[PDB]
Amino acid sequence: STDLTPFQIDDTLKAALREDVHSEDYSTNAIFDHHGQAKVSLFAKEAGVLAGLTVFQRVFTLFDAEVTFQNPHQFKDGDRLTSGDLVLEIIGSVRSLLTCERVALNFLQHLSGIASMTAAYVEALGDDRIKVFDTRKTTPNLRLFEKYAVRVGGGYNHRFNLSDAIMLKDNHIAAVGSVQKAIAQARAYAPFVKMVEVEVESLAAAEEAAAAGVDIIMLDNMSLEQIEQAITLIAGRSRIECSGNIDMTTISRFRGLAIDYVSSGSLTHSAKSLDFSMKGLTYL
Amino acid sequence: LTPFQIDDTLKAALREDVHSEDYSTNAIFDHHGQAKVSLFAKEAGVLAGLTVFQRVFTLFDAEVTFQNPHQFKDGDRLTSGDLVLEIIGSVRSLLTCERVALNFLQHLSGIASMTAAYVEALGDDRIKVFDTRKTTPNLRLFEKYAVRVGGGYNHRFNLSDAIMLKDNHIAAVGSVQKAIAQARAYAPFVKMVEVEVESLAAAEEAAGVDIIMLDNMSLEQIEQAITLIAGRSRIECSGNIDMTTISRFRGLAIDYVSSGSLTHSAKSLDFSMKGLTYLD
Amino acid sequence: LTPFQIDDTLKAALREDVHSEDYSTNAIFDHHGQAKVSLFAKEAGVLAGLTVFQRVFTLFDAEVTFQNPHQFKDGDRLTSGDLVLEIIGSVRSLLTCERVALNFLQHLSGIASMTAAYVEALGDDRIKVFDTRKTTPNLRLFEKYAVRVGGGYNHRFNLSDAIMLKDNHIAAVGSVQKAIAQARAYAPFVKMVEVEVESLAAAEEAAGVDIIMLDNMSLEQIEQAITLIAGRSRIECSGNIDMTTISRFRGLAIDYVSSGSLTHSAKSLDFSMKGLTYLD
Amino acid sequence: STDLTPFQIDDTLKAALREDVHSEDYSTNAIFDHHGQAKVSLFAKEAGVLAGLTVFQRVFTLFDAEVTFQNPHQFKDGDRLTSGDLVLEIIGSVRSLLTCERVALNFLQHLSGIASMTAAYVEALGDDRIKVFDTRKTTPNLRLFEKYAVRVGGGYNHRFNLSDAIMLKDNHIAAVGSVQKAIAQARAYAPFVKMVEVEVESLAAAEEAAAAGVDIIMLDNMSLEQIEQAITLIAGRSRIECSGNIDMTTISRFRGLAIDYVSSGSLTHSAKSLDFSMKGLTYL
Amino acid sequence: STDLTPFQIDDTLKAALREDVHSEDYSTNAIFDHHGQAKVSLFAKEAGVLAGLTVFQRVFTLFDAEVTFQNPHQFKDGDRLTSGDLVLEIIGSVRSLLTCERVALNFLQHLSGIASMTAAYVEALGDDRIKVFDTRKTTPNLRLFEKYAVRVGGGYNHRFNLSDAIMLKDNHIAAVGSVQKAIAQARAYAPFVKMVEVEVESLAAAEEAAAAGVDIIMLDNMSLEQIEQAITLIAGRSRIECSGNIDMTTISRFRGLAIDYVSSGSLTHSAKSLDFSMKGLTYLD
Amino acid sequence: STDLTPFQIDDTLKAALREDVHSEDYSTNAIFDHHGQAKVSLFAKEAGVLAGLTVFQRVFTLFDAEVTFQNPHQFKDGDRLTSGDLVLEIIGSVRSLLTCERVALNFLQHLSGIASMTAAYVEALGDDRIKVFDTRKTTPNLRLFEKYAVRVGGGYNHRFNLSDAIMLKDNHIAAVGSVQKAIAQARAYAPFVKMVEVEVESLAAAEEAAAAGVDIIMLDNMSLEQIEQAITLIAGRSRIECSGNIDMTTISRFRGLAIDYVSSGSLTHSAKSLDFSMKGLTYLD
Structure with a gap:
């Protein structure tokens, strides 16, 4: 029941953001001059196990500190998922949400994959x-x-x-x-x-x-x-x-x-x- | 891929895998000469990031060298039992950074292989x-x-x-x-x-x-x-x-x-x- | 400019300017409270990289703060004798990384100014x-x-x-x-x-x-x-x-x-x- | 009469190359599949003082070790220049020459500028x-x-x-x-x-x-x-x-x-x- | 036991050199041209155990690759020392020798200290x-x-x-x-x-x-x-x-x-x- | 004299923590939950001079920002010590205290050593x-x-x-x-x-x-x-x-x-x- 500290992971994510955003998000910045506060919902679109939710959140907060997170179902890593589940709601500046979304998903998807697969093996083993x-x-x-x-x-x-x-x-x-x-x-x-x-x-x-x-x-x-x-x-x-x-x-x-x-x-x-x-x- | 592009990534991957020293390997260090090790493909697919595989060894130990008998290059097709590379150098230098190199080679050759499957499957x-x-x-x-x-x-x-x-x-x-x-x-x-x-x-x-x-x-x-x-x-x-x-x-x-x-x-x-x- | 983009550049610029410690400054360290310092533009032109100026101070010392009385922003026009920023914090924190910040601000505001001259000179x-x-x-x-x-x-x-x-x-x-x-x-x-x-x-x-x-x-x-x-x-x-x-x-x-x-x-x-x- | 060691400068140039060449030189690599050995001449197009010639050379050798340099006039840093002077000839793979040319010039231009300007002040001072x-x-x-x-x-x-x-x-x-x-x-x-x-x-x-x-x-x-x-x-x-x-x-x-x-x-x-x-x- | 790989130590030594040489070695560069080459002898001035000799050598080679090393007595780490002993001779450019000498000696001194002290405890224990x-x-x-x-x-x-x-x-x-x-x-x-x-x-x-x-x-x-x-x-x-x-x-x-x-x-x-x-x-010559 | 800025030292301490904690503190994390908070007392066990107390504190805060410090005797660097003295009390998450304790003590011990020895020479000199x-x-x-x-x-x-x-x-x-x-x-x-x-x-x-x-x-x-x-x-x-x-x-x-x-x-x-x-x-509480 042990998460990852920011100190452990902060250096790695920062590189992942610099990777995805060399100069600026032109596509996003062209359309949203507003810095208007918005809410976005993170939906699970597949059955499995949730992992690295804190990592998902840390990606957003490293781009923009003023971003915040409602979690209505008290979902945590290791909790089981199903299609059509509202895991997180993400609130903050529109650019801050649309820009580092891809990077955060990449981690969440990748980690939740490993966790899910492990769980399958464990249940499949039976002993x-x-x-x-x-x-x-x-x-x-x-x-x-x-x-x-x-x-x-x-x-x-x-x-x-x-x-x-x-x-x-x-x-x-x-x-x-x-x-x-x-x-x-x-x-x-x-x-x-x-x-x-x-x-x-x-x-x-x-x-x-x-x-x-x-x-x-x-x-x-x-x-x-x-x-x-x-x-x-x-x-x-x-x-x-x-x-x-x-x-x-x-x-x-x-x-x-x-x-x-x-x-x-x-x-x-x-x-x-x-x-x-x-x-x-x-x-x- | 140029070394300048990739060097800093690989160096971190080695520091990752070898925090203190390779105890398992160093415990068996001998007075022996250089050894040779053979890289075999154990699955059918496409070869990718062979230069990356080689760069990992040379960053750990510059004095490591490489025979390539079949002139295998990236993009060439593989099948099980193929001798891709032979790797010559100090025994610790081979046994230590073997895993890290294999991780890149495996991972990249996977992507390449899968791409090729889609391309052939598309047909057009x-x-x-x-x-x-x-x-x-x-x-x-x-x-x-x-x-x-x-x-x-x-x-x-x-x-x-x-x-x-x-x-x-x-x-x-x-x-x-x-x-x-x-x-x-x-x-x-x-x-x-x-x-x-x-x-x-x-x-x-x-x-x-x-x-x-x-x-x-x-x-x-x-x-x-x-x-x-x-x-x-x-x-x-x-x-x-x-x-x-x-x-x-x-x-x-x-x-x-x-x-x-x-x-x-x-x-x-x-x-x-x-x-x-x-x-010998 | 986001901090993530620039942080690693500025940090190297500070390590550059302060290899051991600021002897000149530290020799005068006192028991005094925080001080205020005023950033004046001494030439006519365009302001650029004001956020960069500020980030340099905050990377050295997080507890540093900034009054901006005239709401000056990048791109705004300058003239001699203008109070752009006031900078409040520890005296060593101000006197040490002042040069490094000024170097960025000077350099960037130069480019911006020159661009603006060409743009106005072009006319079309x-x-x-x-x-x-x-x-x-x-x-x-x-x-x-x-x-x-x-x-x-x-x-x-x-x-x-x-x-x-x-x-x-x-x-x-x-x-x-x-x-x-x-x-x-x-x-x-x-x-x-x-x-x-x-x-x-x-x-x-x-x-x-x-x-x-x-x-x-x-x-x-x-x-x-x-x-x-x-x-x-x-x-x-x-x-x-x-x-x-x-x-x-x-x-x-x-x-x-x-x-x-x-x-x-x-x-x-x-x-x-x-x-x-x-x-006080 | 003291140059710069590679150890001092190698880390800085490498970043300058990564800066200018994020993925690959498409413009160059499209046209020159050949890796064909070529020679290129570095001409001074202005009067002044030469500085950071070793730096110019080091940029090329860091991209491609197999690059080499003829210097017909034995030009060294601190030597005076004039328009239309053949400072260096640069021999190696065509891509290696056309790709890191800009980065090398940027250093050479910039440094030779400072040196030139200093020399002007020194002569202008007179004492x-x-x-x-x-x-x-x-x-x-x-x-x-x-x-x-x-x-x-x-x-x-x-x-x-x-x-x-x-x-x-x-x-x-x-x-x-x-x-x-x-x-x-x-x-x-x-x-x-x-x-x-x-x-x-x-x-x-x-x-x-x-x-x-x-x-x-x-x-x-x-x-x-x-x-x-x-x-x-x-x-x-x-x-x-x-x-x-x-x-x-x-x-x-x-x-x-x-x-x-x-x-x-x-x-x-x-x-x-x-x-x-x-x-x-x-x-x- | 076994030595240290360069890959393990290189980054540490490189920082130690940047530490000791922020701008250039003015004292050395003022007196000596880049052209000349020389030999210098490393003497042990105290009784004890030698450790981190490879480290000593790696400091010189990181500053200047063209530096080389004669070792007349085949001294290795773990070998015992006594005062006056010629451990190494060091050959290369004069600046390259006089500049990174201190940094190397610091590692060698420090490590050979620990080793020596360990050896004292081991012998003192007896069992x-x-x-x-x-x-x-x-x-x-x-x-x-x-x-x-x-x-x-x-x-x-x-x-x-x-x-x-x-x-x-x-x-x-x-x-x-x-x-x-x-x-x-x-x-x-x-x-x-x-x-x-x-x-x-x-x-x-x-x-x-x-x-x-x-x-x-x-x-x-x-x-x-x-x-x-x-x-x-x-x-x-x-x-x-x-x-x-x-x-x-x-x-x-x-x-x-x-x-x-x-x-x-x-x-x-x-x-x-x-x-x-x-x-x-x-x-x- | 004057203290060390965080900017000067942060990078050194961060590497020292990564050194001591490559994966996680298994020994600590096995026995203690993330929720609980505690106080720990830093005692001097030897006579000498205190040095790098700010460094000691900066190690804890870099691991865990929410850690805090009572100092009952207003001990500062350069102050003299004797055995048994309560230098600091350290309050925060139990893991955060038990994990980076060693790394901090290493700096404090080492620096306070040098300072102490200097002071001995100075007093021994007399002039x-x-x-x-x-x-x-x-x-x-x-x-x-x-x-x-x-x-x-x-x-x-x-x-x-x-x-x-x-x-x-x-x-x-x-x-x-x-x-x-x-x-x-x-x-x-x-x-x-x-x-x-x-x-x-x-x-x-x-x-x-x-x-x-x-x-x-x-x-x-x-x-x-x-x-x-x-x-x-x-x-x-x-x-x-x-x-x-x-x-x-x-x-x-x-x-x-x-x-x-x-x-x-x-x-x-x-x-x-x-x-x-x-x-x-x-x-x-």
Whole structure:
């Protein structure tokens, strides 16, 4: 239930406005010399989950401080939507509303998309002892936001960057040759403060990895027969994570296993964005 | 894309992914020589932002280099199992900024691929496929390049490029004839003027505007409005456009259709970096 | 000008002028209250970038405030001895960023003033006075605003705004008819197309291009070329333009003349900050 | 005889290129698909002094590293120009030449203007025991460059910013009330490492300022009768500087006085920029 | 351990050079032409440990790319120094050497200080099953560097920032009331990717914390009699860390215990910087 | 002296917060809601001098504008401390207090350290006609702050960077050969706006330097017998500065001389940081 501070996001939005408005909004400024106060209604035009509503609002307030917001239904991020819902009313100068509308929508649409998609996976999974995590597969320079959308949607967050945890991918192991040797080497480097996860595409190597006592074992694209085998072979010495080919329709196979979490890329990188609609402009 | 254009974006993306150091990688640093890694396309589609992929590595580590055995270039078509690039340099330099590069390459090659699908699905090649300002924020420059690569074309980059008069704008002045005159007054002869129009009657009242946009009109109406415009302006179609739908416009004397989804709703393409080995 | 547009420029200008601290000022810091300072115009001309002047102070110190007794606004005319602004706040906050603010105000009000002189000197007000990309670097945004303020209008902001085809470009394709077709091919219907032309013959071959620029042609020739264009395109004049000269164009059916000097060769206006006193 | 390092200026030019080329040079890229190597000649189209030639060159090399430069006459900054002089030849890709030409010229024109103007003042002054300084009256975010142009032109540089020296303007004195008290207060704050200059519009206050032993006294807009009086009244306890209403035609009045330097704003803020010409493009 | 990449440090060094050289080096540029080239010797003037030598070199190369470096004794970071030692020779333009010398020496001095001090604690501790960690008590905007110096000096690194691990101080526990409940609540919030450390000032609470299976237990300023009790009471279910009142002279009391690591502030925040100097300027050929 | 403006410091502090909080404060956010508000007391835990209190406060306000500050004892920078002293009370959202506490304490500790150490040297010197200056030996990208701490502590400031004054070291003189010629050449290059200091390791050269009328003469590591000779030999034509081997215990030898100022590195580069702490968290009303 944790929003984003302005300090975190203010620098990013400001660039998004400068992006969309190099010199001035000619189309808007030509027609509305008035700076006349108006109200505009933000409608959801699709079913899903709301995310980054505060971000939507912050875009307007950064362009024009004197802009204000009625919220009749007390809608908040994480609340579910349906077509034809009045999420927000936006009041202020006509130019201030018509100019930074596109930029705000772009964030709202994009984030609410990720959240919605996460929620679909979570409900589609069904098992709620098993959790749905995300990745660093993200659209660049927006990781902060995209990870918030996943939280909002029912998901959880994996390490934020390379400095958070020690995750040993298949390259890393190939480079030291051994797994036992790779892990020992990681643990040497950062002794007690860093979690150590290992990617593993064979039952044999998962044994060897659990032996050297790693924190998380990631079963990369293994079969259902093999996952079950590997859980009892690990024998709970480490956490289990599943991954690969985890789409909307696949995820349900994990229901009922004693894995701890599945994780997915698509949530962040392949998310259809939700639709919202800007209409009902009227003076006030 | 020039480096000057993109450098400052990529540098922030690296600082994003590497706040302190790459513990996972640095823990395995050895005394070994340079290594080679192979970039494989793991999905069918179009390649875009390969130079961007390369620039990410060179910004982290200047001493990194690139073999390209098949002379793959942006816009070239891909299929699963294709060796696009080989990447040679220090092992930490490869394993660290691999993710950030893949994120750009995946994301851009996705857009390009999707554009190309719409272009081939449309079929008519007198009719062109344009994009929009519906884009993921602070990456507009890149996303528009991907659309070019994919066979598409670019609409105005921002609000300051052209004058586009939406339905709100017209409602506010009341008239269309008066709204356009008022736009043309405000800016000098240098700005294009496009007008959104949801009725045959109002499309007549427009045409000399530069572009007329038929917003979500029917096939019967579009065919009527083209002859009613009588080529005094450009015709654009929009709305209710999806991969399946786009094919209706095939054979009309419109100039271009345009779409959002290309930029905002693009499944990203898949690549991968497998095949790490030390050089001798 | 919005603060978002300008903030990052001004902040660098302050860091420029104040690398360590204002020793001269800080050495005299007291326990006194807020002071008031009066901004006087010390020369005749046009006021421009007053908001910019104010933003400089507020970026250094948010708690600074501004009385404006005569309701002076940008574009208003000045004369020597005029009280434009009074500035109230901490004494260090006033004395430190005074120079940086004056530099913007002086510089912008100069351009605006000079524009206004050309506009009044031209006399014909069917004919408009445009500017160029000849500008002092990294201040183009501001300098173009000053030209608007001064009665002028703005040409394309950069190379990506419009397609302007100079004499080199035409020489390179050989033909004009072919050069234009080739430009219009490259970009979509959204880019204006201007053509530079130093002969009556080549101006005929142009007009449908959007703007035709008569580069340094004679009065006899301009009058011939207007009727030869026959209003199929816009006419612009350029070259050999100075305050004294501009008056020849008075009465022609050209659409606009354009000039460099407005931006690059503008004597800056004079202001001053006298009349510091402590408030009670 | 000191140029500008790339490290000093590279960050500023890069912004100037991004300014002039938001997306691409459509006009150039439409016509020259060839990337065909060409040569272009930089001609001076006006008499004056050359400044920031290295800056001109750096603009090209930042856009395109593979660009090169023939200089047939060994022209350098500070060298005098005349109309119809071949300063530089510029060789490289056709797009690379036609695109960043404008940006480079803008610097070259602007700097060579300042230098030229400085040189005019210096020669017009005639006395070469007396020096011609500049100010912080500068076009913003280009102070570094403009001060270099003044050096090139025969002039010298006054404090770069507020942190260099302690200069007490008439406001500052008005704020402490006394001059004797203002100076003592400055000297207290920064004891031995900072020069202390004082602006003075009366003979009486110049006495008082020289008494309290300041490093420089600035005679702000005083008459010739008064300057002469004040020099012997100072009695060489401090340096003398003159200022105000120092234009092209005025400056000559100071010739033969025992002041140390005059100083001027206009050099930086009111400098007509020199003209250069780009022509003679041909393939190679 | 391993060096620092240029990409990590470049931006920091560039600001440090802009800091020291706002307009130009008048003192240097007045006396020396751009044409001449010279060699300068970096001497260590004090006994200690070398750290951030690559950083020293990167400062020169950022100012002037054409600068180069002879290293006759193959000195590297972590190597021990003594007074008079020729660490580096530095060759290039005279201005390029005399100008950015101070800025480089500042980094080298500062880092080599931390490393040296760490090494003193490590040797003073004596037990090498017990490790010496550092903290976030650091001089600001140089945490990256200071933590590298600690590695070089024989030490190890604690969490880099608040986002690395979950460390539950005494406030945090007071706020939930229970420890068992506080930990459960942390583990709930960040489920599997975050280590969980707990500060504990009583034997009783260390029992309850080890029960709920936390990753690290921090014995905050406990007595030697109590630490020895608490280790067997934890019974190795979790890691033990000691802290508080750990200076140069105290640290030796922990020698021989079955704690895993002690940790200290002073290493980063209260480190006398080592001395070097750049003498022996002469023109080449 | 005077405080630091926000405009001067804001950018530095903002990076220090981004440094310490890359993602979020998990430890804090897990245990405490955004709604609750509390008071926390800043206690000095050590004897010394207070410096950069405004900086401490600016760190909190940059994270969270709605944070506020009671100061019961009207403590200001330059005021003396002793253990147990209630310097500040800090009121606002619980997260806002617990998160940016470390970053603020780091600045306060570090600066108050320098100030304290300066003050020790000043009192240890005893002569108050003689002043204690600092140097560019500083921890990088914090020179602005460290120089303010020296002011606060009773000291004064030397040139900020290479562009401030012209200081001619022994290399510079060796390079022109003469001193009389070196100085003339400096004065030629930057004519009237730059102070000129000269380093001198021999009585003979101090004569020649005072002759050519330089602003400051620096007696580099000279003996007490020699300093006393050189002062009368300069005959007050220029300022005298002493330097080298000036530590806590040495400095007292200069007491009673007619030098103008001694100067030291250690003040900035080798300063033990003062201790504070933030204890006494409780919820308001």
